[PDB]
Enzyme design. Structure first.
Site, PDB file in Angstrom:
ATOM      1  CG  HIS A 195      -1.635  -1.170   1.547  1.00 50.86           C
ATOM      2  ND1 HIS A 195      -1.542  -1.839   2.747  1.00 50.86           N
ATOM      3  CD2 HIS A 195      -2.496  -1.840   0.793  1.00 50.86           C
ATOM      4  CE1 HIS A 195      -2.350  -2.913   2.697  1.00 50.86           C
ATOM      5  NE2 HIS A 195      -2.912  -2.958   1.502  1.00 50.86           N
TER       6      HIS A 195
ATOM      7  CG  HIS B 229       3.181   5.844   5.557  1.00 56.93           C
ATOM      8  ND1 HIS B 229       2.892   5.739   6.898  1.00 56.93           N
ATOM      9  CD2 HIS B 229       2.125   6.462   4.999  1.00 56.93           C
ATOM     10  CE1 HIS B 229       1.684   6.273   7.113  1.00 56.93           C
ATOM     11  NE2 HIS B 229       1.195   6.755   5.958  1.00 56.93           N
TER      12      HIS B 229
ATOM     13  CG  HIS C 278      -0.492   8.683   1.503  1.00 49.87           C
ATOM     14  ND1 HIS C 278      -1.244   7.527   1.516  1.00 49.87           N
ATOM     15  CD2 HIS C 278      -0.148   8.927   2.791  1.00 49.87           C
ATOM     16  CE1 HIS C 278      -1.352   7.123   2.798  1.00 49.87           C
ATOM     17  NE2 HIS C 278      -0.699   7.931   3.601  1.00 49.87           N
TER      18      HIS C 278
ATOM     19  CD  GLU D 228      -3.781   9.760   2.563  1.00 53.40           C
ATOM     20  OE1 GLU D 228      -3.436   9.736   3.766  1.00 53.40           O
ATOM     21  OE2 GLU D 228      -4.386   8.840   1.978  1.00 53.40           O
TER      22      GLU D 228
ATOM     23  CG  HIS E  44       0.827  10.557   6.639  1.00 54.65           C
ATOM     24  ND1 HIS E  44      -0.206   9.825   6.034  1.00 54.65           N
ATOM     25  CD2 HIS E  44       0.568  11.872   6.433  1.00 54.65           C
ATOM     26  CE1 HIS E  44      -1.042  10.735   5.512  1.00 54.65           C
ATOM     27  NE2 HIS E  44      -0.618  11.969   5.756  1.00 54.65           N
TER      28      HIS E  44
ATOM     29  CB  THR F 224      -5.631   8.287   5.596  1.00 49.89           C
ATOM     30  OG1 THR F 224      -4.288   7.849   5.371  1.00 49.89           O
ATOM     31  CG2 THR F 224      -5.669   9.600   6.329  1.00 49.89           C
TER      32      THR F 224
HETATM   33  O1  LIG Z   1      -2.495   0.718   6.826  1.00 50.81           O
HETATM   34  C1  LIG Z   1      -2.257   0.230   7.960  1.00 50.81           C
HETATM   35  O2  LIG Z   1      -1.434  -0.712   8.153  1.00 50.81           O
HETATM   36  C2  LIG Z   1      -2.992   0.829   9.157  1.00 50.81           C
HETATM   37  C3  LIG Z   1      -2.181   1.987   9.693  1.00 50.81           C
HETATM   38  C4  LIG Z   1      -1.074   1.816  10.497  1.00 50.81           C
HETATM   39  C5  LIG Z   1      -0.317   2.883  10.928  1.00 50.81           C
HETATM   40  C6  LIG Z   1      -0.631   4.175  10.572  1.00 50.81           C
HETATM   41  C7  LIG Z   1      -1.720   4.360   9.724  1.00 50.81           C
HETATM   42  N1  LIG Z   1      -2.111   5.712   9.359  1.00 50.81           N
HETATM   43  O3  LIG Z   1      -3.191   5.890   8.798  1.00 50.81           O
HETATM   44  O4  LIG Z   1      -1.295   6.612   9.536  1.00 50.81           O
HETATM   45  C8  LIG Z   1      -2.491   3.274   9.304  1.00 50.81           C
HETATM   46 ZN   LIG Z   2      -0.425   7.866   5.607  1.00 53.30          ZN
END
Ligand SMILES: O=C(O)Cc1cccc([N+](=O)[O-])c1
Ligand SMILES: [Zn+2]
Length: 257
Positions: A61, A91, A93, A103, A116, A195
């Site tokens: 993801h 991470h 997006h 986002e 994030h 999110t």
């Molecule tokens: O997608 C995942 O595994 C759930 C998850 C885990 C950690 C942080 C997240 N966030 O929305 O910042 C989401």
């Molecule tokens: Zn995120």
């Protein structure tokens, strides 16, 4: 299972995760003219000098850079927060094109990507307990715009070839997340959610006003990642963002005039 395609993307998530239609969902559009300056908000305290990065993972993801969170080594305090929040992972997006990927939006403007930095409240003992609490997580959001290169990002970009597909990981030690921050720590804050599924309503969002600049070539390398596992049909990891959700009965507060 859930993803960002036509058949499994954000518009479908509510069937498996009904909290998708909840009262405190993220992301949101930040309307700069209706956010209210709150003089009671404190400066953020970002203490990342002792951070210990461990590993980078493609989870299907996004890619996560994971940290040792077994002690108070890289913590966020102050701002809107009560107590101490430990960094667990960051991470991003991003989009298929430079004009989308974030986002959160600012007066409906989309940025090329959004970082994030995820932190959990130490009073709950572990991350899994913290996500069950309304004040469990604090996520620092930083926008990326395309322009000059960000030198402190390059170590991340150069390892991406080694984690192209879902389930791959690589050792990733001695990475300093301070090289991802903008100059100013002025922010907006509001109560929201994860999110991605499970979309839990456990997050205090802290979104920085000042974007960081990254080069076209840096972002292009994010777009070469794959959602799929090795030896499955290739589907490029692009447009892994959830669109803005209704604000409902929330106020966005600003730390700055
Ligand atoms: O997608 C995942 O595994 C759930 C998850 C885990 C950690 C942080 C997240 N966030 O929305 O910042 C989401
Ligand atoms: Zn995120």
């Amino acid at each position: 299972h859930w993803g960002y395609g036509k058949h499994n993307g954000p518009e479908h998530w509510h069937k498996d995760f009904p909290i998708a239609k909840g009262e405190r969902q993220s992301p949101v559009d930040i309307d700069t003219h209706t956010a209210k300056y709150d003089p009671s908000l404190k400066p953020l305290s970002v203490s990342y000098d002792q951070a210990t990065s461990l590993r980078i993972l493609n989870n299907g993801h996004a890619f996560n850079v994971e940290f040792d969170d077994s002690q108070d080594k890289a913590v966020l305090k102050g701002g809107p927060l009560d107590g101490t929040y430990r960094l667990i992972q960051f991470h991003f997006h991003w989009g298929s094109l430079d004009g989308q990927g974030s986002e959160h939006t600012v007066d409906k403007k989309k940025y090329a990507a959004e970082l994030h930095l995820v932190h959990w409240n130490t009073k709950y003992g572990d991350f899994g307990k913290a996500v069950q609490q309304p004040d469990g997580l604090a996520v620092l959001g930083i926008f990326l715009k395309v322009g000059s290169a960000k030198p402190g990002l390059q170590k991340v970009v150069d390892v991406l070839d080694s984690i192209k597909t879902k389930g791959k990981s690589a050792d990733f030690t001695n990475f300093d997340p301070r090289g991802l921050l903008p100059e100013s720590l002025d922010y907006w804050t509001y109560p929201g959610s994860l999110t991605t599924p499970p979309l839990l309503e456990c997050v205090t969002w802290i979104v920085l006003k000042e974007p960081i600049s990254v080069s076209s070539e840096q972002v292009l390398k994010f777009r070469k990642l794959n959602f799929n596992g090795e030896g499955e049909p290739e589907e490029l990891m692009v447009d892994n963002w959830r669109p803005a959700q209704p604000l409902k009965n929330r106020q966005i507060k600003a730390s700055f005039k």
